[PDB]
Structure formats: C-alpha cells, structure tokens
Design a protein around this ligand. Structure first.
Ligand code: SF4
Ligand code: ZN
Lengths: 109, 463, 254, 109
C-alpha cells in the first residue's frame, strides 16, 4: 500500500497530515487508517510531534497533549493517533465519495 | 500512551467497505411557522402596545379559566371574603384584592437609551451584567394593567422571579394605598400537549438528534476549529468504534451563535462564514443539518430571527440549496417548533433565558447553576417563551398576534448558549415536558445526543 | 472602460451650462447606448433629465454601464478650460475614481488632459410617470426665453393660458402687469419661428418665474423648445438635442 | 445623500424609481435581482451590508419606542406624546422611517 509513500509526500510538505488524509488518499476505512498511522509511529520512526486522542466512557474525546495520560488510565476504552504535525488549514474540500463509513439517508436531488 | 494505544490498536475492521446508511428522522415543516415573518409585509409603523394588549387579553382569559377555582366567591382569608375587582388602580380598602395584569419591573441599572442620548454615549458597548440593585432594594415591581399601576411589596415577591411582561393573577392586600402586599399568585391554565407516540415506531430505535450550540467561529481560532473538526469526524462515524451506536444520530441541530466577530468592516466574518460553509459541505454528505440563527449570527437582532440566507455560504452549499431539498439542510428560524417523528421540539438560541437571568442574577440570593433550569421551568409555567419580549430583549412590534405566547406545550424544550448543561422533566397538569440546557460548544465541547425514543439527553464532551 | 470622444467641446459645455445652476450634483449613467442623467432641485419642483444618444458622440468605448458622480460647478470650471477647435473626450476606467477629459486640438497642438475627481451622490434614479399631455406646443426657443425674461422682470409668478388656439402669457405684478398674446405661427421660410397649438384641452397654469429663469438658460442647445402642458400633470420643457434631449419637468405652484 | 423619499407633493409625486443596480448603479438591470450580471461576484458583501444596517436600525427602533413606553408610564396604552424638547423626539420617527426603507431594501433578495 502507498501509505508510507503518500504520508511522506505530506512530510516533505510541512503541512500536517490528518488521520482522514489517509482516507482521502488511499480510500480505506478509518480503522485501517488508524492501524497504518500506528505502525508508521511504531517502526517507521523521521522526527515529528505526535498527538493522540483517547476515548473514554463519558465519550470525553480529549486531545492528549504533552503526554500526561494521567486522568483515568483505565477509563480509556480506545485511543487513536491523531494528525502528524512537525494547526491545519481546515476542511481541504473533499468530495467525500466512497470515503464515507456512514452514508447519508437522503437523495440530494 | 505508546503502550496504552498498543492494545487498543488491533481492530476487526470488517464492516468497512459497505456504506452504513444512517437513520431517517425528518420534521414536519409544511404546516406553518408562527415565527416566520417575511421582510415584505413587515410593517414597522405600529407601536409596542399591541403586543401587551394581546398578551393581557389572552392571558387574562386563560387565567380566568382557572382563577374561579382557587379564588371563588367563597374563598376567605379570615379578614374578609376575597374580591374580584379588576382595574388594579381601585384598591380602596384592606379587603383581599385579586386581579390580573402585566408585571413590570423597574430597576435602576436597566439600560435607558434616553440617558445615553443625553450623555451622548449611544452606540458604545455595554457591560450590563445585571439590572437588579440587590444591594439597595431600589428596584420595584408594578402590577401594570389597563388603566392602572400598583407597586408590589412584601415577601412573596422574594421567592418567585417576577419578571416583567408576565401576566399572572395576583391576590394581595393594600398596604399604603399605593403599594400592594402580594399574598399569592396563580398561573395560567395548563395547555394541551400532543401525545408522545414512542413505541408505535416500526423501527425499534427511533434514533437521536445532535444538539451543539455556540460555535462562534472567529479568526482568532483558539482551537475552536479543532473541536469543530473532531465533532465532524465523530458525527462522521470515525472517532467512534461504531457498533450501530453512532449510526443512530440522524439529524443535527445547531442552535444559534455559529460565527463571531467584534463589530470589523466585514472581513473576519467572511472567513468565519467560509469555515462554516466548509464544515457544512464536509459533514452534509453523511449527516443532515438544520441551523438556527442566533443574536450574533448574520441575521436579525429582533427575537423572531428570520432564517439564514444562501449568500452567506460557499458554492458547494449553494448546490445543496436546490429547491425541494430541505431534508438535507433546513435553515429554520431562531425559535422553531420541529416535530422529529411526533416529538414536538421547541428550541431557542437562549437569549431569552440569559435576559431573564439579567433580571435575577446580580453582578458585583439566587446563583446560577440549576436556577437557570428553574427559570426555564417558570417560562414553561407561564405560556410565553419571551416574557421580556418588547422591553428588554428587542423583538418585532407584533400586532394582533404574538408568536412568543405558547399555544401548546412541546414534548421537549431546548435552550442554547447556556453556561451549564442540565436536563429536567417538569409536569404542569399532567402534560410533562423535557427541558434541556445545551451549553456553548466553544467554551465546553459538550454536545447533546437527545434520544427521540425516550428523551435521554446524553452528553458527549470534546476537549 | 468608458471612452466618449465628442465632436466639439462647445456642445458639452452648453449641455452642462443649460442646467448647471438649477441642480448642482448629478449622476451620469454611461450605459451601452449613450449617457443619461436625471436630477431634482432642492425645491423638489424641478426635475432635469438629459439623454445624449451615442449618435451625438464620435466614439463610444464604454462596454459596462458606469456611473459618474458629477459636481456641476467643478465640471463647468473644467469645461471653461476648453477651446472651440478641440475634440473633447471623456475617459473613465473600470472603477472610476476620477474622470479624464482631453481637449486634443484637431491640428497637432497641446492636448489638455484634466483629471476631475468624482463623488458618490448616492441618489435615486427617477423617471417621469408619463401621461398624454393636454397640449404639446412647439415654439422658437429664443422668443420663449425673451418672453420669460421680460415678464419675470415685472413679477415673480408667470401664468400661461393655452385657450382657443392662441398661446398667452400673463403676469400680474405690483408695479403693473404684462400680457403677451402670441398667435399660432407657421412659415416656410423660417422653420424655427413655428408655433402650432393643440386644442386638446384648455390649459391655464401659473409657474414660478424663479424656475423658468433657469429653464430658459438651456435655450442655446435647441433652436426651438417643446412645452407640454396639462392641468394635472406637471409641465415639460423639452430642448431637443442631436441625439437626445435636455427636458425639464416643472410643477405649477399650489 | 439625496433623500427624495416620502416627499409627495407638486412634483415629488407620480415619479418612478428605476431601481438601478447596487454597488455599480448600472441602469442595465433588466435582469431581475438586486445586482447586475457584471458585478455579481459581490453578492455576498452587499447583503451583509444591508443586513447589518437593518440590524442596527431595528435595535435602535426597539430601544427608542420601548424607552418611550417606559417614559409614558403606560404599557397597554398608546403613547401620543407632543413633547418636542425630548432628545428622543424627532429621532423615533426618523429611525422608524429609515428602518422601514432599509427593510424594504432588504426584501429585494
Ligand atoms: S419622546 Fe420623550 S416625552 Fe415622548 S414618550 Fe419618549 S421620552 Fe417620553
Ligand atoms: Zn452592477
């Protein structure tokens, strides 16, 4: 898969790469994109500032910065690895075709 | 977190290829809207006394439908049988007088435009954290009425909020021939409330709705757009491990205060509108949104804020703005009455409740943690959502018809832009309704999944 | 970009001086078929309306309808700086901050490039609600101007009586009175001296002389003036142009 | 700013307003709408200007008339006040008229 290559294109370019940029590029599901970013952080580590978002029971989706991870280590049911930054010009308009885990219930006529 | 995410980052990812169709929950709009007020046929030559005439008339009728019950001809106070004499000016003796009329508060810190025109300080910003003195007791409460105004004094007025514009039946005694000792009050008769057909739905889960308010996007952007993007992804079914739990969010409601700029020269506002249009175009292909204007949104300042205009959004949204396509985007007025498959919902930007809090909560006893829920409960005890409609929170000078007065109690009542989150079910004569206080998304990232099945306002905080 | 090259600066100078006194700030609408500008005086009883079709000009490069906030005193000052052998051209860019006026002499000589600042008078563009006038008379303009002058010398309220096919002006002042009774005239030798009344409706109207004294100033452009009168509709004085008009709309005082 | 509004008299009556284009005053507004096809790119700014003018005017109108009611002491009665020495006198009617005109101008979109 071109993940390792198409991520680096967003790394020669200083602009950060979202975890949704993987869905925009390779047209893969969110869970696979998260696995890709995780393995890239595991064994494919230039130098970059990392930010993770840990879910909770109260759905307290918080951006874990400064790597504290003190509050409720056990109450965290999931934690994705968020965008890679060395914020971002937000909503680089995507057509969202075939990039939807959940499609809309309507027609757009 | 390097090992905290280790065990977490091994997923099944088996339901990825297919597109998970969301739920279908619309709202009935073809009927009417009491708050729709086109700019054409908008007469401004009238005066604000027609609103009070209509209020007094209809509220006096509704309360007289129930004043005879507790204040009949045989009701005694051990001093003398209670008297029915209206025209509040004619309190001539110590007999217990009960009468109906519009409450009017007279504080000393209420913004008086005439003083500003005198001092030539009009147009300047205002701190006006509160109106009540609360340290000198200079504020008064007069039972204003057609040909009459009598001050009220005593201890009963220290419990009830007693906000101006409300029309309730006051029974008391004449104290100093100009004052009035409020002994008790009576509220209007209970309104009808449509049933709640919860279990009849063919689908087992009638779905939820997402409530988020106080976006107030601005060029300063202290991570205000980061929370917005996280919320977009969360509603997009990515941040959650969906087991058909985030696929039951359906509609999404944004109630007022979407943009923000310190009014300069309409440039930062354009960037905020561009960011909002980007968010809408990026979230609409999956979710269906309907936006309520606010007092800071690019819409009217009077309370019945007409809906947004298409000229505020980019071209992709304009494509979505095709006719006969309101199921995707709606752009309702500020106070709107949805019907999410039988769940009659009433939502307001929250300016009315904040203005009411200006009438009780003082600046530099009643604090504001749950007393705001009590203020909404009072607003529902009365039958108008804007008691201070003409006088304090400026509105259109309606004539012969007021949309702020209620005609039926809604199953849900949402108040946006509140400093805190809280929900409460209140029952007034069998018809019990849910009242939710959705906070500002900018300060605290809390959004509210309001369930339509059984009205459980769950919270989802984003930090 | 507007580029209206005239044929002679005296034409535009007279066009402006015809109504530079009654009104003072106008909006010239350089559209795709010439120039049109209407305005109302402060007394709100006189409405000037000028239309110069593209035929009167020599060149017209205006491709987008532009507006020029002309102040008539400054523009008259600029036009007084023109010769009688120059082809004045008005140039304006896309978004006009100023207007360029070039009185380039036909023979190779000193070109006169003036840059006049523009304003935004933010006024409304008006138009008369037309109606079949009771009498559309034509009369040599010099005679009408002389009549208005010598009558206004007496009083400050001139009256017109269009009855039984004889145009009549009367003025009753303090020092006396003056009554001019001109018959409907027609001749083949002098076409300017032509007066053909209309017996559609008898008209007895009185106008303020303080406005006719300004009407008669645009008497040099048109050799003859067309006065349309109606007992209810406001009177019109049309000074015809080569491809337009400089018509005034006046209402009888009441 | 030449007002020429609500001055119906000897000549200011039975006169038209051709409703030229906005921000360019182009008389070639045969095509309906508050803007001509030439300067249609500014359709998002002129609406903002008109709407904010209407906002200021309606706020001022409400403040002035509600203030008049507070001064008159009466709320359910009509305030027919002849006091011409009040700073708000001569101003409430002006703001009413101006807000009427600006709202009628906003109703063209
Ligand atoms: S204009 Fe002056 S006198 Fe009249 S109601 Fe208003 S404040 Fe009172
Ligand atoms: Zn234009």
């Amino acid at each position: 898969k071109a993940s390792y290559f198409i991520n680096e294109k967003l790394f020669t370019e200083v602009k950060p790469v979202l975890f949704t940029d993987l869905i925009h590029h390779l047209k893969i599901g969110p869970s696979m994109a998260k696995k890709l970013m995780f393995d890239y952080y595991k064994q494919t580590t230039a130098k970059y500032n990392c930010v993770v978002i840990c879910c909770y029971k109260d759905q307290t989706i918080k951006i874990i910065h400064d790597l504290s991870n003190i509050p409720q280590q056990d109450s965290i049911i999931d934690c994705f690895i968020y965008a890679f930054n060395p914020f971002i010009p937000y909503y680089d308009i995507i057509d969202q075709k075939d990039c939807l885990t959940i499609k809309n219930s309507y027609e757009l006529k | 977190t390097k090992f905290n995410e280790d065990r977490s980052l091994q997923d099944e990812n088996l339901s990825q290829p297919r597109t998970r169709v969301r739920i279908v929950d619309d709202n009935l709009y073809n009927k009417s809207n009491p708050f729709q007020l086109c700019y054409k046929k908008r007469d401004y030559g009238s005066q604000y006394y027609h609103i009070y005439q209509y209020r007094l008339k209809t509220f006096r009728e509704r309360v007289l439908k129930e004043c005879d019950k507790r204040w009949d001809a045989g009701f005694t106070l051990n001093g003398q049988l209670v008297l029915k004499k209206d025209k509040v000016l004619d309190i001539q003796g110590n007999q217990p007088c009960w009468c109906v009329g519009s409450i009017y508060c007279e504080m000393k810190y209420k913004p008086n435009v005439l003083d500003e025109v005198i001092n030539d300080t009009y147009g300047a910003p205002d701190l006006t954290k509160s109106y009540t003195d609360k340290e000198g007791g200079s504020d008064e409460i007069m039972l204003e009425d057609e040909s009459g105004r009598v001050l009220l004094v005593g201890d009963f007025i220290r419990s009830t909020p007693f906000i101006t514009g409300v029309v309730v039946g006051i029974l008391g005694m004449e104290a100093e021939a100009g004052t009035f000792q409020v002994l008790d009050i009576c509220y209007p008769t209970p309104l009808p409330q449509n049933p709640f057909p919860a279990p009849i739905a063919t689908c087992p889960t009638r779905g939820k709705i997402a409530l988020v308010s106080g976006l107030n996007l601005n060029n300063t952007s202290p991570d205000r757009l980061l929370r917005l993007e996280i919320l977009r992804e969360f509603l997009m079914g990515r941040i959650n491990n969906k087991i058909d739990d985030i696929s039951l969010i359906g509609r999404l409601l944004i109630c007022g205060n979407s943009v923000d700029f310190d009014i300069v020269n309409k440039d930062e506002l354009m960037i905020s509108l561009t960011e909002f249009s980007k968010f809408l175009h990026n979230i609409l292909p999956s979710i269906s949104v309907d936006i309520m204007p606010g007092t800071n949104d690019p819409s009217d300042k009077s309370l019945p804020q007409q809906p947004f205009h298409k000229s505020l959004f980019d071209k992709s949204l304009e494509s979505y703005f095709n006719g006969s396509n309101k199921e995707i985007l709606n752009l309702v007025t500020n106070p709107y009455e949805f019907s999410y498959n039988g769940v009659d919902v009433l939502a307001v930007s929250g300016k009315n409740i904040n203005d009411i809090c200006k009438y009780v909560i003082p600046s530099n006893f009643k604090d504001d943690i749950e007393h705001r829920l009590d203020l909404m409960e009072c607003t529902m005890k009365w039958q108008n959502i804007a008691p201070t409609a003409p006088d304090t929170l400026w509105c259109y000078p309606y004539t012969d018809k007021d949309p702020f007065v209620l005609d039926k109690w809604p199953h849900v009542y949402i108040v946006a832009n509140q400093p805190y989150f809280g929900t409460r079910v209140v029952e007034i004569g069998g018809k019990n309704i849910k009242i939710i206080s959705v906070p500002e998304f900018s300060s605290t990232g809390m959004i509210i999944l309001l369930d339509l099945e059984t009205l459980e306002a769950e919270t989802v905080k984003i930090d | 970009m507007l580029e209206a090259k005239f044929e002679e600066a005296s034409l535009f100078k007279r066009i402006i001086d015809g109504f530079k006194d009654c009104v003072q700030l106008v909006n010239f609408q350089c559209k795709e078929d010439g120039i049109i500008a209407q305005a109302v005086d402060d007394s709100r009883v006189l409405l000037v309306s000028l239309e110069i079709g593209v035929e009167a000009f020599q060149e017209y490069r205006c491709d987008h309808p532009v507006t020029l906030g002309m102040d008539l005193t400054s523009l008259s000052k600029i036009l007084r700086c023109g010769n009688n052998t120059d082809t004045l051209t008005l140039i304006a860019d896309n978004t006009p901050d100023s207007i360029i006026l070039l009185f380039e002499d036909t023979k190779k000589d000193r070109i006169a490039e003036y840059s006049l600042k523009l304003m935004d008078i933010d006024a409304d563009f008006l138009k008369i609600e037309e109606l079949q006038y009771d009498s559309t008379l034509s009369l040599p303009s010099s005679e009408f101007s002389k009549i208005v002058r010598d009558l206004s010398q007496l009083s400050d309220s001139i009256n017109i009586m269009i009855t039984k096919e004889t145009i009549k002006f009367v003025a009753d002042g303090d020092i006396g009175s003056g009554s001019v009774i001109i018959k409907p005239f027609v001749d083949m030798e002098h076409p300017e001296t032509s007066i053909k009344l209309e017996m559609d409706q008898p008209v007895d109207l009185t106008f303020g002389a303080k406005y006719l004294l300004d009407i008669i100033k645009g008497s040099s452009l048109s050799d003859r003036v067309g006065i349309r009168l109606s007992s209810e509709a406001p009177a019109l004085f049309q000074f015809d142009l080569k491809s337009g008009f400089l018509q005034f709309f006046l209402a009888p005082k009441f | 700013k030449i007002n020429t509004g609500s001055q119906k008299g000897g000549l200011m009556s039975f006169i038209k307003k051709v409703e030229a284009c906005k921000s360019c005053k182009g008389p070639l507004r045969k095509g309906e709408g508050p803007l001509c096809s030439n300067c249609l790119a500014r359709s998002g700014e002129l609406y903002i200007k008109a709407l904010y003018d209407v906002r200021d005017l309606e706020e001022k109108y409400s403040r002035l008339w509600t203030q008049c009611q507070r001064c008159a002491g009466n709320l359910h009665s009509e305030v027919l006040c002849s006091n011409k020495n009040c700073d708000i006198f001569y101003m409430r009617v002006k703001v009413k008229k101006e807000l009427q005109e600006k709202v009628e101008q906003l109703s063209k979109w």
